[PDB]
Design an enzyme around this catalytic site. Structure first.
Site, PDB file in Angstrom:
ATOM      1  N   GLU A 265      20.613  51.122  65.211  1.00 42.46           N
ATOM      2  CA  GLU A 265      21.996  50.984  64.787  1.00 42.46           C
ATOM      3  C   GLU A 265      22.895  51.762  65.709  1.00 42.46           C
ATOM      4  OE1 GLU A 265      22.813  52.058  60.701  1.00 42.46           O
ATOM      5  OE2 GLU A 265      21.025  51.022  59.977  1.00 42.46           O
TER       6      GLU A 265
ATOM      7  N   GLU B   2      16.547  55.169  58.314  1.00 46.78           N
ATOM      8  CA  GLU B   2      17.168  56.478  58.110  1.00 46.78           C
ATOM      9  C   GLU B   2      16.500  57.365  57.051  1.00 46.78           C
ATOM     10  OE1 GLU B   2      21.390  55.940  57.814  1.00 46.78           O
ATOM     11  OE2 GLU B   2      21.501  55.242  59.905  1.00 46.78           O
TER      12      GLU B   2
END
Length: 315
Positions: A246, A134
């Site tokens: 994810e 991320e």
């Protein structure tokens, strides 16, 4: 058709500003039995978060041998269970709270970290390189340049391993083509070249209102499909592959329908999707954590595992 199906074993990335931190207090690695439990559920892939600060305590410096050894031990457990291991440098494009692209953390520093990891793991076919968890607070073109540098550094070592490359803006699938965060990931990453031709784009997708995975609500029973489509079409046009690094859903009826819909969607779009890893398992989630699939002390399966296992075994 889907190649990789599995879970994140979370724990080694905990307490992210304690450097080095204390093993079994501030962070932990998974038990060997975690790997066998998930392999028993049909999962062939483990995503393993760990910290840049713990594996490389000085930028451009040697890898920490203790931390490396812990990673290698997890790799041995993965191999024993015929699992792939995604090495997830779980850092949000930061090192010690400082963003890549600042004078303190040049993009070249990430390339050096991955050069060193590639030299260690180039001869392990089970190992997949998850460049960065991320990235955010860095523009898509700036991130694309840092990613290119890192890909190039890995391939210079001879490593042929799969590389998972994220976009910026928390690498959300839903926002892949958006400009809320600047120039878009879609636009910025079209230029990337992998001389080893073994790249996939890592996206994350949560199903709550703002797609942050902070609330145990799925906005609708089909929001997964809706949110993945922009990214899926981008992959297919550009002849690229994707990996859902994810995703999660809470234990309620709308979320279960949304989970079934999303996992079915990834089967139907397996020409471009390589697979998925659920967030998360690992032994350190509290009892109220809505996304845990770590089995109970009693050995029982968590609610979402009934659905995850069905799809994992189908792959």
């Amino acid at each position: 058709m889907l190649k990789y199906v599995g879970v994140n074993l979370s724990g080694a990335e905990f307490n992210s500003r304690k450097k080095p931190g204390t093993l079994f207090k501030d962070y932990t690695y998974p038990a060997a039995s975690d790997f066998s439990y998930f392999a028993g559920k049909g999962m062939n892939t483990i995503r393993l978060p760990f910290l840049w600060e713990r594996v490389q305590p000085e930028l451009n410096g040697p890898l920490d041998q203790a931390q490396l050894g812990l990673i290698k031990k997890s790799l041995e457990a993965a191999k024993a269970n015929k699992q792939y291991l995604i090495l997830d440098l779980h850092n949000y494009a930061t090192y010690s709270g400082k963003r890549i692209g600042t004078s303190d953390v040049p993009a070249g520093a990430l390339a050096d970290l991955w050069r060193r990891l590639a030299l260690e793991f180039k001869d392990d076919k089970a190992v997949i390189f998850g460049l960065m968890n991320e990235p955010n607070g860095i523009s898509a073109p700036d991130w694309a340049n840092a990613a290119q540098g890192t890909i190039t550094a890995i391939r210079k070592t001879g490593a042929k391993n799969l590389i998972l490359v994220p976009g910026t803006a928390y690498t959300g699938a839903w926002s892949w083509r958006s400009t809320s965060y600047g120039v878009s990931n879609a636009k910025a990453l079209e230029i990337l070249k992998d001389p080893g031709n073994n790249l996939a784009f890592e996206a994350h997708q949560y199903l709550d209102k703002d797609a942050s995975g902070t609330k145990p609500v799925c906005t609708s029973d089909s929001v997964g499909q809706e949110r993945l489509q922009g990214f899926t079409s981008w992959l297919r046009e550009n002849k690229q592959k994707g990996f859902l690094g994810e995703f999660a859903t809470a234990n309620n009826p709308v979320c279960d329908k949304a989970l079934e819909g999303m996992l079915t969607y990834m089967e139907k779009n397996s020409d471009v999707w390589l697979g998925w890893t659920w967030w998360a398992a690992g032994a350190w989630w509290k009892p109220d954590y809505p996304f845990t699939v770590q089995p109970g002390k009693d050995g029982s399966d968590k609610p979402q595992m009934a659905i995850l296992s069905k799809y994992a075994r189908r792959a």
